[PDB]
Design a protein around this nucleic acid. Structure first.
Length: 297
RNA sequence: ACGGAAACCUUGAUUCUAACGCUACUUCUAAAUAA
């Protein structure tokens, strides 16, 4: 709600479920887990947990940043009320395919897209796969996909200006983010910027109008029905093997279905720092699904 | 408590075998006319 944390990447691998896949942007659960792990290994885990449990804490999904804050395509607003055209069906299907292919809009034209304007994607990163082997038994051949950014494209996240969070970010920029961090993939350089004046007035947490979630958030049971009864959304799985130092064997942490970004809702709701630890294991796994909204027209 | 942790695109392999810078060739020819 306060800052515009930008992070310049050169090579990163954010898995989509398999090691051979690599998404362009990471979700908020990945960065929250990275921060929690950094605080735990440094020693100040409880301070970060107390800050996260407070309602002032905020975190959003990674979004592209290329000479201007970019944002998620609003799911459910190509609405025909502003998309009615007299063109033939060939152009109608071409523009529908172009809209479906679009994944990230620029902040300068977000309202323009809500008016019915059409935009295209931009060169951000190339998803390349490199094959490596294990020459210790000479019977291994694995493949890792990466997301080497260029065109001076960085990633940005929106978090509060806090000394703890800034310190954890600065410690994380030499620890990498996601993937084979101790193999080259994941490293980044941190910078801290102020939110542009065209974003801070709309980046919100509470009104009753239509608000795009900017985070993979899961409402509590109190307002879930009201969320989906008049909402447009997408579902993502936060499954995986829970990285932990207190087991000799990896355990599949509990699957979780979360509302992606940008899911549009008729009102704001409350998130959850949900425990997804397997039964009978002292330290838990925290999945951050807490909303940061965007006010729309 | 990051679909994460551990993995060298590594092991050996001569741009190598054959092939005359070779063939014919005198550092040599002409002495007029005048006295």
């Amino acid at each position: 709600t306060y800052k515009l944390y930008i992070m310049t990447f050169q090579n990163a691998h954010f898995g989509s479920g398999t090691l051979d896949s690599s998404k362009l942007t990471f979700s908020a659960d990945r960065i929250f887990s990275a921060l929690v792990l950094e605080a735990l290994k440094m020693g100040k885990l409880d301070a970060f947990l107390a800050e996260a449990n407070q309602d002032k804490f905020t975190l959003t999904d990674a979004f592209p940043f290329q000479f201007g804050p970019f944002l998620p395509k609003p799911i459910g607003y190509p609405k025909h009320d502003q998309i009615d055209q007299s063109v033939d069906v060939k152009e109608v299907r071409r523009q529908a395919k172009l809209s479906k292919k679009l994944q990230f809009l620029a902040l300068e034209n977000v309202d323009d897209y809500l008016n019915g304007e059409l935009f295209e994607n931009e060169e951000h990163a190339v998803i390349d796969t490199v094959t490596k082997n294990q020459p210790h038994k000479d019977d291994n051949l694995y493949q890792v996909a990466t997301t080497r950014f260029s065109n001076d494209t960085s990633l940005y996240v929106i978090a509060n200006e806090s000394d703890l969070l800034n310190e954890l970010m600065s410690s994380l920029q030499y620890s990498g983010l996601g993937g084979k961090r101790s193999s080259g993939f994941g490293r980044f350089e941190l910078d801290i910027q102020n939110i542009p004046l065209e974003l801070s007035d709309r980046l919100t947490k509470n009104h009753s109008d239509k608000v795009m979630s900017l985070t993979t958030a899961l409402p509590v049971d109190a307002d879930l029905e009201e969320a989906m009864e008049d909402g447009h959304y997408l579902l993502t799985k936060s499954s995986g093997f829970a990285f932990s130092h207190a087991t000799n064997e990896n355990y599949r942490k509990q699957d979780l279905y979360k509302f992606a970004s940008g899911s549009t809702f008729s009102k704001t709701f409350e998130g959850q720092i949900v425990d997804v630890r397997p039964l009978d294991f002292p330290h838990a796994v925290l999945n951050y699904a807490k909303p940061l909204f965007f006010k729309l027209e």
